[PDB]
Amino acid sequence: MRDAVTTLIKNYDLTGRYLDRNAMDELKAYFESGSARIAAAAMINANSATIVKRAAAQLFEEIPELIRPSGNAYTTRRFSACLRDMDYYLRYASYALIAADNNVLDERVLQGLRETYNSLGVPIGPTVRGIQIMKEMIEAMAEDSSLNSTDFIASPFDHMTRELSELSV
Amino acid sequence: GLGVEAQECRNWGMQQDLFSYSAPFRKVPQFITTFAQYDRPLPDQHVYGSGNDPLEIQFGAIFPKETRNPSKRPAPFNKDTKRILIHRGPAVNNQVGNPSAVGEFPGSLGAKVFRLNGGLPGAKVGKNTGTSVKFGESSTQALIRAAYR
Amino acid sequence: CKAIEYMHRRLLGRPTYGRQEMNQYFDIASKQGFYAVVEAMIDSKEYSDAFGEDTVPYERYLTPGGLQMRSARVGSLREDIGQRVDKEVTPRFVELGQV
Amino acid sequence: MRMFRITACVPSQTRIRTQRELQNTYFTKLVPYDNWFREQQRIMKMGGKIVKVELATGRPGTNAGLA
Amino acid sequence: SIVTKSIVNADAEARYLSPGELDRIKAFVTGGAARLRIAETLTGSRETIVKQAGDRLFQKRPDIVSPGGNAYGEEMTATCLRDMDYYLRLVTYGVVSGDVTPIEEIGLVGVREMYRSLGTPIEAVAQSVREMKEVASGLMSSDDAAEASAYFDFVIGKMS
Amino acid sequence: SIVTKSIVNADAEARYLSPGELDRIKAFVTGGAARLRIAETLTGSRETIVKQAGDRLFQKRPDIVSPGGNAYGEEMTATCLRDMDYYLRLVTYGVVSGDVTPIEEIGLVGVREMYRSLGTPIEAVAQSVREMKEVASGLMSSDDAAEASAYFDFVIGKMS
Amino acid sequence: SIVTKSIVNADAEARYLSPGELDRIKAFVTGGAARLRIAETLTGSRETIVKQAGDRLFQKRPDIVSPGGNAYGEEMTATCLRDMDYYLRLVTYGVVSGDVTPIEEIGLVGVREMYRSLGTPIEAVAQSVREMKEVASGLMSSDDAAEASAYFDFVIGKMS
Amino acid sequence: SIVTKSIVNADAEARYLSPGELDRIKAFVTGGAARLRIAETLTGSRETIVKQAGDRLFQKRPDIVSPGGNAYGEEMTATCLRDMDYYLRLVTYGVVSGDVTPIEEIGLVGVREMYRSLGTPIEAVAQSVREMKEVASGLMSSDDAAEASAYFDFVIGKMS
Amino acid sequence: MQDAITAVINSADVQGKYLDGAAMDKLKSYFASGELRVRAASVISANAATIVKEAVAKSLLYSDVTRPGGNMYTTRRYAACIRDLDYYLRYATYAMLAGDASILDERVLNGLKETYNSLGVPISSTVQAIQAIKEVTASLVGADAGKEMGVYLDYICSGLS
Amino acid sequence: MQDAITAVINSADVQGKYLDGAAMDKLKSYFASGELRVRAASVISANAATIVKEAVAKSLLYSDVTRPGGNMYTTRRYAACIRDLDYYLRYATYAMLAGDASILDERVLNGLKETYNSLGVPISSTVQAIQAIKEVTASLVGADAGKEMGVYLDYICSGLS
Amino acid sequence: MQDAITAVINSADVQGKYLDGAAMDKLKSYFASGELRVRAASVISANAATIVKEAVAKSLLYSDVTRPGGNMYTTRRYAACIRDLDYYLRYATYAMLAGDASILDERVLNGLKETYNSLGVPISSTVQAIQAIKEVTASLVGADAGKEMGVYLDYICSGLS
Ligand SMILES: *[C@H](C)[C@H]1/C(=C/c2[nH]c(/C=C3N=C(/C=C4\NC(=O)C(CC)=C4C)C(C)=C\3CCC(=O)O)c(CCC(=O)O)c2C)NC(=O)[C@@H]1C
Ligand SMILES: *[C@H](C)[C@H]1/C(=C/c2[nH]c(/C=C3N=C(/C=C4\NC(=O)C(CC)=C4C)C(C)=C\3CCC(=O)O)c(CCC(=O)O)c2C)NC(=O)[C@@H]1C
Ligand SMILES: *[C@H](C)[C@H]1/C(=C/c2[nH]c(/C=C3N=C(/C=C4\NC(=O)C(CC)=C4C)C(C)=C\3CCC(=O)O)c(CCC(=O)O)c2C)NC(=O)[C@@H]1C
Ligand SMILES: *[C@H](C)[C@H]1/C(=C/c2[nH]c(/C=C3N=C(/C=C4\NC(=O)C(CC)=C4C)C(C)=C\3CCC(=O)O)c(CCC(=O)O)c2C)NC(=O)[C@@H]1C
Ligand SMILES: *[C@H](C)[C@H]1/C(=C/c2[nH]c(/C=C3N=C(/C=C4\NC(=O)C(CC)=C4C)C(C)=C\3CCC(=O)O)c(CCC(=O)O)c2C)NC(=O)[C@@H]1C
Ligand SMILES: *[C@H](C)[C@H]1/C(=C/c2[nH]c(/C=C3N=C(/C=C4\NC(=O)C(CC)=C4C)C(C)=C\3CCC(=O)O)c(CCC(=O)O)c2C)NC(=O)[C@@H]1C
Ligand SMILES: *[C@H](C)[C@H]1/C(=C/c2[nH]c(/C=C3N=C(/C=C4\NC(=O)C(CC)=C4C)C(C)=C\3CCC(=O)O)c(CCC(=O)O)c2C)NC(=O)[C@@H]1C
Ligand SMILES: *[C@H](C)[C@H]1/C(=C/c2[nH]c(/C=C3N=C(/C=C4\NC(=O)C(CC)=C4C)C(C)=C\3CCC(=O)O)c(CCC(=O)O)c2C)NC(=O)[C@@H]1C
Ligand SMILES: *[C@H](C)[C@H]1/C(=C/c2[nH]c(/C=C3N=C(/C=C4\NC(=O)C(CC)=C4C)C(C)=C\3CCC(=O)O)c(CCC(=O)O)c2C)NC(=O)[C@@H]1C
Ligand SMILES: CCC1=C(C)/C(=C/C2=NC(=C\c3[nH]c(/C=C4\NC(=O)[C@H](C)[C@H]4CC)c(C)c3CCC(=O)O)/C(CCC(=O)O)=C2C)NC1=O
């Protein structure tokens, strides 16, 4: 995996350049954001399980059929597996928030998601809907909390949405 | 397997293909190739799969058989994904960057071009019958045989 | 799809750019048939521009894999393609002692 | 099947060709009935003038047997 | 979007964006506020516009809810209004983006073949689209009514 | 003409013009008044622009008007000025139409061959067009001069 | 600077800053962003701008570079290019300051006398600055080109 | 090469070489001694031909080497002479091959694009090749000069 | 290709709901940046060939790449290298106008690596050339639009990586 | 494709050198061999079908290959094999004329091994048939030209096997 | 894998015949060449590192490949290229000893092109490096064994292409 600093370093090493003023500026921006990154990660760690439970309790009301017959969370086994996927999404989103880069997100989440979910027959739309529900809950809780900077939180979840979402248009 | 433990969603198809008894017959490494392809961008490959690209030989629709020596290399090709094709003629003549040069002919850089440039024999009544040595008919015979080829 | 791809390569000298062309000819094949797929490929404006009413089609574009197969063998491989070509020069002492 | 014998004159508009172009400049061809509409559309879009059109094969108003 | 359409045309011609295309994008980015207002009005009148248009369509064509009709039954009527909502959302996306492409790709290309399988009357759905258009125009200001009506009529023509 | 191009594309795709194409058409018609004003300024200043650009080109390349040159003599100078006037009129046609299509159709296709036949230097023709562009831009407002600069540069680039 | 001119005008009447001068100052501060964009474009393009303008000048007026001309010789050509660079830098100063006062104070007071002393054609220097104006205005948008044209024209007027 | 061209043609019609093609190849093989002699002459007198052609071209077109020109400066002139040497080498390759294929492949496809990008006048480069042709024709008898004139004129026509 | 607006609309469509406040925020942010994007695109379009000339002079000219034995040696290959730089500049302009690298993935970086590998193109040389293009464009357009363009140019370079 | 002349010219061009003494000597050697090459090409073109017929009779006919279950069983497969041998002989003649195997690599051997592997064509049987063709051509053409044709036919055999 | 002995044995066995005079002549030829094969193998084993070193210095070093952005930039990538050359030399020696290019086909070529295509490795440049290895091995072993080694090196190159 690569965080923002490592991805910048790799980008500059690609051209074989020394770290210039723009590199220093990007590094300074990340290093100043690091306080809010750690704060948001601590908050999401504090409220993790509750966040995923509430996100599922909203998503199964948005699309009720995932718990009715022929739905993909019908059994308690399927329900627990779905909640496990949601917890995985939250944990890797937290890792990506701390790292300030979505490559750790890609290498360990998205790179085969459609293949695995298609093989298991899991829908690929409700999952991103639940992802966005988690992101909304996370950002609402952050806004309620004393987090001066919270814009970066939408980046990991939105990248997950863009990658794992079917290209509708 | 899938039920024995937790399966990471990064080597799903790879391990699915590996566990089956047909594993020792796919000789092409399906693990290193996909692991590199994740970090690399989209490959030079047909939209619907690697097996869907015929060999670039003179004749014969030689395709990689999906079941014989398994070498399928699926890639996520969306709709609006134009391919990069190397022009036979001059590189400047590629219609991607030279859209008005489609009719250009590849002089000495591409394959030969066949046209009905010469008048077909018997086109006009100027050759009033006879004329067994009416010169332009080998050209049209070569044109027809070249269209066949 | 393999048949349509080979047909396109054969009747325009060009591999299909991708899913847009493949979808067009694929809908043609599903709706009308082989004859209409061939008719569509022949009557496409790209065919008209590349070849008039008097030009036989020819191979106009090559995939990178095919180009590599053609021009990467030990024969037909240029000296300067993927190699550092050092300009050979006679030794300076040989030139000095040369009459 | 019904066939159309069409004579037309299609000029060039973009480039000054230096190869013999009279054959596709003024010509007559036997296009099928099922292709006549699209051929006419192509000639019009290219800017040609349809000098003449005749029904070389078949007869007008054939309800059945036009194959 | 308008940007994507201009970029695609410029790419196909193998050129940079025209000065006219750039000016069109300039005007669009300036009028983004008004188009956002139009989309927000549509989203506000979502559950009312579709309901009224469906009511008018039912009163125009009883056969759809009559015996032997495509949408016989409350479930079929609810799904018909679901298609109504989907087309209204598509129109919202289209007015926001300044291009019909988001409308067409999601819900216009091959729509006749998609609804032939279901047996629904294509002209009936076009009439429903029309009725939604009049409802939106009624609940919309004058000029932006015309702006959205352009896209609504485009969908109407392409589907009908 | 943008109208001509949009109609040609619509026919080629076999459908009515897109709403975006109609928007482009209406915007072009709106700007047609300013385009007509630019064309009127150019046609009013055709004489002074032609004379000034011709004199500047002669000074830059006196060999063209020097004995043994293509433009040497009163008749050759008159024909050179006639070509300048023709190209200025073509630029006016382009500014009116909003496109370089009329210029390309009338006096910009085969021009290299025609000047090779007549012996005229295409370099001299391009420099003359550049001088005309400079004179017109000096005589015209910056925005209008910038607009006409597109046609002038298109002509110059096709010359060279 | 516009700030300098307004503050000086106020002090010459011994009053505090008038509402009109404060309005002018606010407009200047608001347009400062565009000023810096123009100035940064100029400084980034200083090498290309100076090179192209020098080439155009040495083509239009070969007398200055021919033997017996002031710019004849490698060193004289380099010094002519250095003077072009000086005037481009002064243009950048004027662009940043929103007026031509820095250009006046540094390189437009006694320029006629200095170039008379050095033996240079002031009309040739003005031509060089005009070509710099054309090259620079070719490297920016319509409004920015018109903005920089004011400083360029001021230098042209002060030199001729 | 005539052999390569004949083989390519025979491959294109998928047939063995015609007796006429074989006779032509045999004639070229027999006559290769004269081609080698011409190539040896050009190779031996390359530096003299390049120098004289460069001087003649510079006198004919002083602006390209005067300040503000593409080739002004000692290193720029060295590069111009290097270009002329490259084209002389290409002409020798073409003479040895008996076909213009090597010349077209190495230094005639995209030449207009290359020189337009560099800013070098393509007609000036053609005039340089013409001067080289004249010098080479002077440095050999009519027969060998007549043979080399084919490739020289081919390069000149492609450049023009 | 998907611009910022099409990206937002796609993210909303795949969830089936209407553009809520976040979508409007993203749309208005893109519209606010649109003026700068359009200015930079128009300036680059006007000075398209000059940028390529400056980049080629800064990177490849008078080097082993352009000398005999280099892939940029023959005139046809020089013209092809120039055309490739034109592609990169035009597609960077496209990605700047669209706020996305989707066009770069779909059309530019799609098969490009093995395309150059089969052709024998020097990857490091083309990377340095794209860097020169990026720096020249930054100089000609400004720090902000320069960095915006450099985002897509560095995306292309990292794709070549 | 490249003949001997084009190969020498490309070798000179890659180093950016005029044709020196060694290149001239190579060209002289090729010109000397040109008459023999042309004569052999004419002889092979005259006896094209006969050479293939004799080779197939010597190496393939009256064997499991032609009998049912063999690759050359059906009339269609026999015709295909004869056509393949004809192509091999014709392209070997092209290579002998050009003095170079570039045409063989570019238009014959590219993917030929993969083609036979997919089709099930017996590589060893094809190699033996080409060997028979080489012997027949040697007997029908002579010693030196036969040796050159054998060189190029063995090049094809090496590429195939 | 298969050597000459096993190859001829399998060729006889598949059609079910004993070893005739023709096969015995092939085995006699292999036994005649065995001494030269063993000497060449010993020489190459002695000079394995030097051969790859000289080939890399003669083909790859100071090119676009080693510079930043090239496929031999990082030290790990350089060591990987060296390891690939070591494989190619060692397996060429194996095939030279065995008198059959079957170990190359079943342990170096079947899928290697796919792996390089996935990894972006330049096949043309690796072919050039293998050619340099061939030249160095020929210079170090002699013409007779050098040609035999080059046969299998070219086999590897053709398989890669
Ligand atoms: C309480 C007295 C009764 C009750 C209520 C209740 N259930 C849920 C939620 C769920 N119940 C199920 C049921 C099952 N899963 C299985 O695998 C089986 C098969 C044996 C059963 C019966 C499931 C899947 C859910 C989750 C999805 C959902 O929302 O229905 C709730 C809601 C809890 C919440 O909102 O978080 C409530 C109130 N369940 C009982 O068993 C009692 C009879
Ligand atoms: C919940 C939001 C949705 C849902 C979930 C669901 N998932 C599965 C099974 C699996 N999910 C995954 C996913 C991942 N594994 C990973 O390692 C990663 C990243 C760390 C991801 C995203 C995998 C691999 C499986 C199978 C293997 C496993 O779980 O160990 C199921 C099971 C379905 C069944 O019938 O067994 C379910 C139900 N289902 C819904 O309806 C929601 C929309
Ligand atoms: C429907 C039962 C399920 C489903 C299918 C689905 N497929 C596509 C797209 C394509 N399917 C094909 C099919 C074939 N190619 C062949 O060569 C053959 C016959 C030999 C077949 C059957 C192809 C070529 C495509 C691509 C079409 C195109 O390029 O436009 C889609 C749509 C994909 C898209 O993005 O448009 C779908 C939905 N999907 C399901 O979930 C169903 C279970
Ligand atoms: C010049 C002396 C006269 C003249 C010329 C002129 N010609 C055209 C158009 C065409 N000319 C031809 C003629 C030929 N094409 C051939 O291939 C051959 C046989 C080898 C000949 C004789 C054709 C076919 C055309 C059609 C267009 C085309 O060239 O493809 C034009 C008009 C061109 C146009 O598009 O408008 C003109 C002006 N005009 C005169 O007034 C002179 C008397
Ligand atoms: C002046 C800037 C340049 C120049 C002019 C020049 N032209 C001619 C002769 C002709 N010029 C044309 C060109 C056109 N005729 C048209 O109708 C149009 C369509 C837009 C064009 C462009 C033609 C056809 C002629 C032939 C004569 C005629 O007009 O009927 C000459 C005379 C050439 C001679 O030797 O007689 C000259 C001098 N010459 C330069 O050097 C300038 C660059
Ligand atoms: C001299 C007659 C003209 C002239 C020459 C000139 N050329 C350059 C620069 C280059 N010229 C070339 C051309 C070629 N390279 C090749 O390999 C071949 C094919 C065999 C050709 C034709 C190239 C590639 C360059 C780029 C620089 C480099 O070689 O590395 C210059 C300098 C341009 C500059 O500003 O750097 C000049 C002056 N100039 C004229 O005005 C004459 C008409
Ligand atoms: C220049 C910076 C480098 C360079 C360039 C170079 N390229 C080619 C040939 C081609 N380049 C492409 C690339 C593209 N085509 C596309 O459509 C796009 C995406 C939109 C790209 C990036 C292609 C396809 C070709 C092949 C011809 C064709 O365009 O169809 C060459 C010539 C190679 C040859 O042997 O002719 C060269 C030299 N070379 C360098 O050294 C620079 C680093
Ligand atoms: C004859 C010595 C052996 C033999 C031949 C054989 N070949 C085929 C079929 C094909 N052969 C080819 C070969 C080529 N295509 C090319 O473009 C070139 C490059 C110059 C070559 C050599 C191809 C493509 C085919 C496919 C069929 C077709 O002809 O299009 C067959 C028949 C295969 C079948 O089942 O139809 C045969 C019999 N067979 C032997 O046993 C001989 C050793
Ligand atoms: C200097 C302290 C020591 C030294 C240096 C030396 N190195 C070379 C040649 C090369 N060095 C490298 C190393 C790297 N390239 C990379 O990309 C990386 C990481 C960024 C490293 C470490 C390489 C690849 C080469 C090969 C040539 C090339 O760069 O393309 C030499 C020259 C060797 C020769 O004979 O050519 C030298 C002298 N030598 C010493 O004695 C010092 C201890
Ligand atoms: C199943 C389809 C099929 C066909 C058609 C076929 C034909 C066939 N006939 C052959 C030979 C032959 N066939 C004939 C037969 C004839 N002589 C005449 O005068 C008659 C006209 C004709 C029979 C009526 C002869 C004489 C030969 C030997 C040719 C020679 O040895 O030169 C051979 C080559 C030798 C061999 O059989 O191995 C083939 C392949 N084989 C097949 O598998």
**Per the CB < 8 Å rule, is G37 touching I43?**
no
Cα dihedral sign, F146-F147-F148-F151: positive
**What is the SS3 assignment for E34?**
helix
H159 lines ligand 6 (CB under 6 A): no
Q: For residues H80 and H65, what is the distance between their CA atoms, to the nearest angstrom?
A: 10
**What is the SS3 assignment for J29?**
helix
Distance of CA G140 to the CA centre of its chain: 16
J58 touches J46 (CB < 8 A) = no
Burial class of residue H94, CB neighbours in 10 A (0-12, 13-18, 19+): buried
- Amino acid at residue number J124: S
K157 touches K131 (CB < 8 A) = yes
Q: CA nearest H99 in B: which residue? A: B108
- Report which protein residue has its CA nearest ligand 6's atom 37: H80
Q: For residues H26 and H12, what is the distance between their CA atoms, to the nearest angstrom?
A: 21
K137 touches C81 (CB < 8 A) = no
- The resolution of the experimental structure, rounded to one decimal in Å, is 2.6
- Other beta carbons within 10 angstroms of residue C99's beta carbon come to 2
CA dihedral in degrees (F20, F24, F25, F29; nearest 10)? Answer: 150
Q: For residues K65 and C82, what is the distance between their CA atoms, to the nearest angstrom?
A: 9
Cα dihedral sign, D29-D32-D36-D38: negative
Cα-flanking dihedrals φ and ψ of residue K110, to 5°?
-75, 90
Two structure tokens written together for J54: 């004799």
**Per the CB < 8 Å rule, is H111 touching I53?**
no
Q: How many alpha carbons fall within 13 Å on the CB side of residue J161?
A: 19
β-pair partners for I58: none
- The 8-class DSSP code of residue I122 comes to -
Q: For residues A98 and A39, what is the distance between their CA atoms, to the nearest angstrom?
A: 9
Q: Among A67, A108, A118, A120, which residue has the most ligand 2 atoms within 8 Å of its CB, making it the best to mutate?
A: A120
Counting atoms of ligand 3 from 1, which one is nearest the CA of C19? 29
Burial class of residue H78, CB neighbours in 10 A (0-12, 13-18, 19+): exposed
Interchain contact K21–I (C-beta under 8 A): no
Q: For residues A34 and J99, what is the distance between their CA atoms, to the nearest angstrom?
A: 69
Residues of B numbered 122-141 whose beta carbons fall under 8 angstroms of chain E's beta carbons: which are they? none
Tokens 């190029």 -> residue: J152
The DSSP element (H or E) to which A122 belongs, if any, is none
The DSSP element (H or E) to which E68 belongs, if any, is none
Q: For residues J58 and J63, what is the distance between their CA atoms, to the nearest angstrom?
A: 10
DSSP codes of every residue in F57-117: HHHH-HHHHSTTSTT-SHHHHHHHHHHHHHHHHHHHHHHHHTSSHHHHHHHSSSHHHHHHH
Cα dihedral sign, J161-K1-K3-K9: negative
Name residues whose C-beta falls within 8 Å of residue K101's C-beta, 6 or more positions apart in sequence: J161, K95, K151, K152, K155
**Per the CB < 8 Å rule, is I69 touching C87?**
yes
Two structure tokens written together for K139: 């210079």
**What is the SS3 assignment for D6?**
strand
What percent helix, strand, coil does chain K show, rounded to 5? Answer: 80, 0, 20
Q: What distance in angstroms lies between residue F142's CA and the mean position of ligand 4's atoms?
A: 43
- Residues of H with Cβ-Cβ distance to G66 under 8 angstroms: 66
Alpha-helix runs per DSSP H in chain I: 4-13, 21-46, 48-59, 75-98, 102-103, 112-119, 123-141, 143-160
A4 touches A99 (CB < 8 A) = yes
Cα-trace Rg, chain J: 18
- Report which protein residue has its CA nearest ligand 7's atom 25: B86
Q: For residues D55 and D2, what is the distance between their CA atoms, to the nearest angstrom?
A: 7
- Residues of B with Cβ-Cβ distance to H14 under 8 angstroms: 145-146, 149
Q: For residues I127 and I148, what is the distance between their CA atoms, to the nearest angstrom?
A: 18
**What is the SS3 assignment for F147?**
helix
At what angle are helices I143-160 and I112-119 packed, to 10 degrees?
60
Two structure tokens written together for B75: 């890639």
J75 lines ligand 10 (CB under 6 A): yes
Interchain contact C52–D (C-beta under 8 A): yes
Q: Among A60, A82, A83, A92, which residue has the most ligand 2 atoms within 8 Å of its CB, making it the best to mutate?
A: A82
C-alpha distances (whole Å) from E25 to each of A153, F60, F95, J28, K115 are 30, 41, 21, 67, 45
DSSP codes of every residue in H91-130: HHHHHHHTSSHHHHHHHTTTHHHHHHHHT--HHHHHHHHH
Burial class of residue K62, CB neighbours in 10 A (0-12, 13-18, 19+): exposed
The DSSP element (H or E) to which K16 belongs, if any, is none
G5 touches G97 (CB < 8 A) = no
At what angle are helices J123-141 and J48-59 packed, to 10 degrees?
130
What is the side-by-side strand order in the sheet with D49-55? D26-32, D3-9, D49-55
Q: What's chain F's length in residues?
A: 160
Q: How many helices (H) and strands (E) does chain H have?
A: 8, 0
Q: What distance in angstroms lies between residue D47's CA and the mean position of ligand 4's atoms?
A: 16
**What is the SS3 assignment for B21?**
coil
Two structure tokens written together for H46: 């390359």
F55 touches F135 (CB < 8 A) = no
A123 lines ligand 2 (CB under 6 A): yes
Of C64, C79, C80, the CB nearest to I118: C64
Q: For residues B77 and F130, what is the distance between their CA atoms, to the nearest angstrom?
A: 47
I61 lines ligand 6 (CB under 6 A): yes
K96 touches K40 (CB < 8 A) = yes
Give I109→chain B minimum CA distance, Å: 7
Q: What distance in angstroms lies between residue J136's CA and the mean position of ligand 6's atoms?
A: 54
Closest among E89, B17, C22, B76 to A124, alpha carbons compared: B76
Two structure tokens written together for J15: 């180093």
Cα-flanking dihedrals φ and ψ of residue B67, to 5°?
-100, -25
**What is the SS3 assignment for D5?**
strand
- Residues of C with Cβ-Cβ distance to I117 under 8 angstroms: 64, 68
- Amino acid at residue number H111: V
Tokens 């295409």 -> residue: F122
Tokens 């009339």 -> residue: J75
Two structure tokens written together for D26: 């003024």
Two structure tokens written together for K120: 């972006």
Two structure tokens written together for K58: 């003669």
Counting atoms of ligand 4 from 1, which one is nearest the CA of D9? 26
Alpha-helix runs per DSSP H in B4-137: 12-19, 32-39
Q: For residues I41 and I34, what is the distance between their CA atoms, to the nearest angstrom?
A: 10
**Per the CB < 8 Å rule, is E24 touching F22?**
no
DSSP codes of every residue in K74-138: SHHHHHHHHHHHHHHHHHHHHHHHHTSTHHHIIIIITTHHHHHHHHT--HHHHHHHHHHHHHHHH
What percent helix, strand, coil does chain E show, rounded to 5? Answer: 80, 0, 20
Task: Bin B120: left if φ > 0, else alpha if -120 < ψ < 50, else beta.
Answer: beta
Burial G80-119 (b: 16+ CB within 10 A, else e): bbebbbebbbbbbbbbbbbbbbbbbeebbeebeeebeeee
Cα-flanking dihedrals φ and ψ of residue D53, to 5°?
-140, 130
Cα-trace Rg, chain G: 18
Strands (E), chain C: 61-62
- Other beta carbons within 10 angstroms of residue A158's beta carbon come to 20
B91 touches I85 (CB < 8 A) = no
Name residues whose C-beta falls within 8 Å of residue E17's C-beta, 6 or more positions apart in sequence: E6, E7, E10, E25, I41, I42, I45, I93, I97
Q: For residues D51 and D26, what is the distance between their CA atoms, to the nearest angstrom?
A: 9
Q: For residues I16 and A35, what is the distance between their CA atoms, to the nearest angstrom?
A: 36
At what angle are helices D33-46 and C34-43 packed, to 10 degrees?
20
Task: Bin B82: left if φ > 0, else alpha if -120 < ψ < 50, else beta.
Answer: beta
- Amino acid at residue number A135: K
Cα-flanking dihedrals φ and ψ of residue A72, to 5°?
-90, -5
Q: For residues J65 and J123, what is the distance between their CA atoms, to the nearest angstrom?
A: 12
Cα-trace Rg, chain B: 26
- Report which protein residue has its CA nearest ligand 6's atom 43: H125
Tokens 């993790």 -> residue: A48
Q: For residues F71 and F63, what is the distance between their CA atoms, to the nearest angstrom?
A: 8
Chains touching K by CB (3 or more pairs below 8 Å)? A, B, C, I, J
Q: What distance in angstroms lies between residue J126's CA and the mean position of ligand 3's atoms?
A: 41
In a mutational test of the I interface, the residue from E5, E6, E7 whose CB has the highest number of chain I CBs within 10 Å is: E7
Q: For residues F101 and F93, what is the distance between their CA atoms, to the nearest angstrom?
A: 9
What is the set of domains in chain J, with CATH numbers? 1-161 (1.10.490.20)
Q: What distance in angstroms lies between residue B33's CA and the mean position of ligand 1's atoms?
A: 45
Q: For residues E133 and E95, what is the distance between their CA atoms, to the nearest angstrom?
A: 13
Strand D26-32 to strand D3-9: parallel, antiparallel, or no bridges (unpaired)? antiparallel
D25 touches D6 (CB < 8 A) = no
Q: Determine the Cα angle at J34 with ends J33 and J37, to 5°.
A: 90
**Per the CB < 8 Å rule, is I74 touching H107?**
yes
Q: Among J62, J65, J73, J75, which residue has the most ligand 10 atoms within 8 Å of its CB, making it the best to mutate?
A: J75
